[PDB]
Amino acid sequence: NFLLFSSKTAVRGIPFTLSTQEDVMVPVTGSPSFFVGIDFDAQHSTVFYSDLSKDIIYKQKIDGTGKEVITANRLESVECLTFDWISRNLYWTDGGLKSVTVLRLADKSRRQIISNLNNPRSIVVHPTAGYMFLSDWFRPAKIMRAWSDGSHLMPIVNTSLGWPNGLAIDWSASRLYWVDAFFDKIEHSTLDGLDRKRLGHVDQMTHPFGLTVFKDNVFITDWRLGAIIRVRKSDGGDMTVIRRGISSVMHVKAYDADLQTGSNYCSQTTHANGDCSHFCFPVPNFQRVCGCPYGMKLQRDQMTCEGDPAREPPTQQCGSLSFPCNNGKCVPSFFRCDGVDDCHDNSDEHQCGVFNNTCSPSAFACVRGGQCIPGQWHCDRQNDCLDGSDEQNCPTHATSSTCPSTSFTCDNHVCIPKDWVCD
């Protein structure tokens, strides 16, 4: 077990004890990055996350050796990930599409179970209990629960609530904790929304976002502090800061190999995933129900699936004005062959300036073809193109120009404030 948390910068794993502050897992980082959803799979020791700058959901091992994409198609803003460790279904809320999507890992079946929401932020799934929990922070804010299927969607806490930014489940006692960022409070209740109690006032917590519950403690992430803080799950009490001065601080999640155990009818050893082809979902009173991907309907057997192009006709990777990448991304057509890797797998920059896959206006053309570089790298004093045709034949920028009298002319013919001489 260790405390897993995200950021603008990177996703990090730190020990629960403050005695040692050395990262337990190698940080996950990219140069264009903004990491907002996170969840873990202790069986294969992998961590799922979403990069809101690339709109791609990845999975990466703890030691960082193996990184792959889960999906990169039709994502707008994946606010929160959650993983059903028994049935191996990955759920996520989409703030842009205003919907929540379930994806199976064994085969890439995908289904948009819940739609037509307003501001879905946080999602938590309870495999053994069978419920999924969701928060919407629109004006009539509510916390909703439903079966893992996505049916029976009914409100659970819809009064005295505003901006419920985060949800967490106390696995030890089967209680649902959530944070309110408007009233600046932590509340908890049973899975039925009854016996609602409010924790004691926390000292400086004033814009909480993510929380998680581990042993006797709640770990809250606060945006305004830029910090992760810890309190007792009973009444709050002895607030302790775990890290200080994050860039932007997003979710926390308690990695734990102990809680990712147990089984139900979806993980029986005697037969495959509860005999349901494609998706099987846990249901309360320890039942299971089968599902089928988009474009496919469940048959009379209530377990096998067949194609239904009448209600759910097939769709292409994306609309007309765009190029489909290999990883499933889609990019505007006028960003193909610009020398910039926009697909994040170099699909849009493959085989440019040959067989009439022409370069875009954003590139400069190599003389003999077979490559393009950004127009910003033409005459940039670097030899980017193999034949040197980007730096050959480059005229100077020794123009008829002057520098403002308030300013000093560098010998490189750039102007600076006259006060920056001899500093």
Ligand X SMILES: *[C@H]1O[C@H](CO)[C@H](O)[C@H](O)[C@H]1NC(C)=O
Ligand Y SMILES: *[C@@H]1O[C@H](CO)[C@@H](O)[C@H](O[C@@H]2O[C@H](CO)[C@@H](O)[C@H](O)[C@H]2NC(C)=O)[C@H]1NC(C)=O
Ligand Z SMILES: *[C@@H]1O[C@H](CO)[C@@H](O[C@@H]2O[C@H](CO)[C@@H](O[C@@H]3O[C@H](CO)[C@@H](O)[C@H](O)[C@@H]3O)[C@H](O)[C@H]2NC(C)=O)[C@H](O)[C@H]1NC(C)=O
End-to-end CA distance of the chain: 51
Q: Is 319 in the site for ligand X (CB under 6 A)?
A: no
- Sign of torsion, CA 183 122 78 21? positive
Phi, psi of 344 (to 5 degrees): 65, 10
Residue whose CB is less far from other proteins, 72 or 181? 181
Which amino acid, residue 327?
A: N
Q: 274 by DSSP, 3-state: which?
A: helix
CB of 326 to ligand Y, least distance (A): 10
Which amino acid, residue 58?
A: Y
CA distances from 369 to 153, 347, 362, 379, 391 (A): 57, 18, 16, 17, 15
Q: Which of 174, 134, 139 is nearest to 157 (CA)?
A: 134
Q: Is 396 in the site for ligand X (CB under 6 A)?
A: yes
Name the residues that contact ligand Y, by CB under 6 A.
Answer: 351, 355-357
CB of 161 to ligand Z, least distance (A): 10
From CA 111, how far away is CA 292, in angstroms rounded?
8
Which residues, in sequence order, are bridge partners of residue 102?
A: 91, 111
- Dihedral in degrees, nearest 10, Cα atoms 159, 206, 11, 136: 20
Name the residues that contact other proteins, by CB under 8 A.
Answer: 36, 52, 77, 79, 95, 98, 116, 118, 121, 137-138, 140, 163, 165, 181-182, 207, 265, 268-271, 274-275, 283, 287-290, 298, 300-303
Q: Which of 17, 269, 270, 402 binds ligand X (CB under 6 A)?
A: 402
Picked from Ca ion, ligand Z, ligand Y, none, the partner binding residue 303 (CB below 5 to 8 A depending on kind) is: none
Q: Is 73 in the site for ligand X (CB under 6 A)?
A: yes
- Cβ–Cβ under 8 Å, residues 253 and 212: yes
Q: Which of 128, 158, 248, 358 binds ligand Z (CB under 6 A)?
A: 158
Total of residues contacting ligand X (CB under 6 A)? 18
Picked from other proteins, ligand Y, ligand Z, none, the partner binding residue 355 (CB below 5 to 8 A depending on kind) is: ligand Y
Q: Which stretch binds ligand X (CB under 6 A): 157-165, 270-278, 279-287, 392-400?
A: 392-400
CB of 181 to other proteins, least distance (A): 6
Which amino acid, residue 374?
A: P
Residues of this chain that interact with ligand X (CB under 6 A) are 73-74, 110, 294, 315, 317, 333, 356-358, 360-361, 395-396, 398-399, 401-402
